[PDB]
Amino acid sequence: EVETFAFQAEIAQLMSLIINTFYSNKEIFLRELISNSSDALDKIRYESLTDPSKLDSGKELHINLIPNKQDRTLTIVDTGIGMTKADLINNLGTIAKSGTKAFMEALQAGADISMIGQFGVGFYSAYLVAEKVTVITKHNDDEQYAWESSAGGSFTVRTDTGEPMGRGTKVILHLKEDQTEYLEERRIKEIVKKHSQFIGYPITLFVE
Ligand SMILES: Oc1ccc(-c2ccnn2-c2ccccc2Cl)c(O)c1
């Protein structure tokens, strides 16, 4: 059972903008994804302070970067708050309809694509390098779900019948053929050092 949904008009627009705008500084995608993983880890950390039973799905709060040259994928895994089916469907737990306006308005007002995060829509920068994005997620108050989109104005949601995660978000980037640099160890290492050098959680770059 696969559910297909239309993106909200503004989000669909933002996506085609990211896919069609000639913008060479694509590496900003990683900082945006790691920053979201950090935000998700801050949410579970804060919830765990009041009630410690929130960590009964995993105590480790971390970020893993998993390149795979065989499948042409870069996976960003976090052990953060995760998303419920409703969070996942609701513009991916954000005010993305509202935030898209502010960003598209700013792009006309001098600003460039690298400022996407400042409008809370940094996730869509994944489409600067990915031809398809799969988001596997698990929240404490729901089951495991897989969200997927190759853009084109729609996304799908299904329950994931794959490997249980415990809690957190797995962002699988199915990279475009000309974007395989983001699978190279030295290239990832350089991006993390340049943009994510002060994240408050361990970032592990897996080797092949
Ligand atoms: O790449 C991602 C994308 C999304 C999430 C995520 C899980 C729970 N909330 N969110 C979320 C959603 C939209 C904006 C910011 C955040 Cl933190 C993540 O942890 C990594």
From Swiss-Prot:
Q: Where does ATP bind?
A: N36, D78, K97, F123
Subcellular location field: Nucleus; Cytoplasm; Melanosome; Cell membrane
Instruction: Please give the positions of the paired cysteines in each disulfide bond.
Output: none
Q: Which domain of life is it from?
A: Eukaryota
Substituting G82D results in:
Abolishes ATPase activity
Task performed by this protein: Molecular chaperone that promotes the maturation, structural maintenance and proper regulation of specific target proteins involved for instance in cell cycle control and signal transduction. Undergoes a functional cycle that is linked to its ATPase activity which is essential for its chaperone activity. This cycle probably induces conformational changes in the client proteins, thereby causing their activation. Interacts dynamically with various co-chaperones that modulate its substrate recognition, ATPase cycle and chaperone function. (Microbial infection) Seems to interfere with N.meningitidis NadA-mediated invasion of human cells. Decreasing HSP90 levels increases adhesion and entry of E.coli expressing NadA into human Chang cells; increasing its levels leads to decreased adhesion and invasion.
Family label: Belongs to the heat shock protein 90 family.
Protein's name in the database: Heat shock protein HSP 90-alpha
**Annotated organism of origin:** Homo sapiens
